[PDB]
Amino acid sequence: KVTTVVATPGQGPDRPQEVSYTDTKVIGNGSFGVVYQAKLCDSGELVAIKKVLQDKRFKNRELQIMRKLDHCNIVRLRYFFYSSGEKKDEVYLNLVLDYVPETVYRVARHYSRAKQTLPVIYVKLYMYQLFRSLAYIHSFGICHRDIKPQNLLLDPDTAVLKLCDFGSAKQLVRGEPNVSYICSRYYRAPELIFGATDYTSSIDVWSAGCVLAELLLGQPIFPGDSGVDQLVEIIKVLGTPTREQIREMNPNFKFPQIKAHPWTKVFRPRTPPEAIALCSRLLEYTPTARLTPLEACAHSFFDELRDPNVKLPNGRDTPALFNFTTQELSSNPPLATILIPPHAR
Ligand SMILES: O=C(Nc1cnccc1-c1ccccc1)c1ccnc(NC(=O)C2CC2)c1
Numbered sequence: 001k002v003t004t005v006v007a008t009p010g011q012g013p014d015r016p017q018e019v020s021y022t023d024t025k026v027i028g029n030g031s032f033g034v035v036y037q038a039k040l041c042d043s044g045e046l047v048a049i050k051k052v053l054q055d056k057r058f059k060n061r062e063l064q065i066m067r068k069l070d071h072c073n074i075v076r077l078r079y080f081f082y083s084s085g086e087k088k089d090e091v092y093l094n095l096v097l098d099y100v101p102e103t104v105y106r107v108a109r110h111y112s113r114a115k116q117t118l119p120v121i122y123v124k125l126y127m128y129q130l131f132r133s134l135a136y137i138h139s140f141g142i143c144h145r146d147i148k149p150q151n152l153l154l155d156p157d158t159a160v161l162k163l164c165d166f167g168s169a170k171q172l173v174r175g176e177p178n179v180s181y182i183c184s185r186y187y188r189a190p191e192l193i194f195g196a197t198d199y200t201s202s203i204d205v206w207s208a209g210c211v212l213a214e215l216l217l218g219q220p221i222f223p224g225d226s227g228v229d230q231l232v233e234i235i236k237v238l239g240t241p242t243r244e245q246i247r248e249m250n251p252n253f254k255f256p257q258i259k260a261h262p263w264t265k266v267f268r269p270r271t272p273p274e275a276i277a278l279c280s281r282l283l284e285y286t287p288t289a290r291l292t293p294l295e296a297c298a299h300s301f302f303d304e305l306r307d308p309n310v311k312l313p314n315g316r317d318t319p320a321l322f323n324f325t326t327q328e329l330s331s332n333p334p335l336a337t338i339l340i341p342p343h344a345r
Pocket residue numbers: 027028029030032035048050075097098099100101102103150151153164165166167
């Protein structure tokens with residue numbers, strides 16, 4: 001019925017509170033553990049509870065990253081607490097998060113299975129907000145490392161996107177090596193497939209680019225169940241990478257010598273050229289030639305979002321889009337002139 005636990009608020013001072021919740025049910029199972037959904041008694045608010053086994057040795061990295069995060073496009077840690085339950089005398093970490101009812105995956109799938117495309121204004125709204133969350137976490141040196149449609153939460157009434165699952169997220173320091181086997185199926189950057197250990201935070205941007213193409217195409221842009229297949233699909237668009245381009249990703253195989261497909265010809269006829277242009281500047285072999293998250297926010301493809309008259313198809317106003325903080329703009333402070341339009345309060 002009602003479950004009452006003593007939970008530590010995520011943000012703020014470490015002062016634990018009795019928190020009660022009912023209607024608990026399962027909404028996810030995975031390598032990480034299990035996610036529940038329940039209703040808070042004192043508010044009626046829906047929450048998602050992510051339950052993971054707690055490493056006895058070290059502190060949980062996800063918890064420590066999520067406790068440092070505060071941004072309108074990242075899912076909020078409301079509380080966290082510790083429980084028992086299975087394994088063998090082990091401790092479980094429970095991350096209590098704001099429940100968001102939808103994901104880009106489920107929504108993209110509705111449209112693909114209905115054979116329409118997701119309206120571009122949603123592509124603008126969703127992609128812009130993803131790039132904001134990245135601008136933010138990247139300013140801390142934190143790379144998400146598993147950006148994909150299932151990790152992009154959506155509230156279809158407000159058009160708010162929230163990035164979730166920081167289970168793979170890590171701070172990337174120059175000269176410190178990092179595992180290359182992060183990141184999922186269709187969204188791995190070529191330098192990961194090639195097994196680079198010196199990759200940078202632009203892998204997230206490659207991934208984001210894959211989401212954008214997919215929202216435009218109605219299907220993944222680089223499918224394949226092996227790296228080899230994914231790589232072949234990549235070369236079919238970007239063309240065969242050059243010696244310099246290969247070096248910028250890795251050592252040490254020749255490839256199909258196939259010339260580039262004209263990016264205008266990779267998408268449906270009605271596709272906006274600003275979107276095709278933004279794709280081409282995210283999906284670059286050379287990981288330093290890719291746009292930064294903040295630069296992409298400032299991209300012309302998103303200009304419509306900065307129009308004073310724009311509204312959601314449901315009639316409502318657009319959600320927070322311009323509350324940039326100094327931290328978020330740090331990559332490139334002068335972009336504020338473009339990012340914060342005259343009407344934004
Ligand atoms: O953190 C979350 N999940 C996760 C955390 N870590 C890893 C994976 C997930 C996850 C699990 C299932 C679906 C989407 C994400 C999480 C947080 C808030 N809302 C949702 N909502 C939903 O799942 C919507 C009903 C679809 C998921």
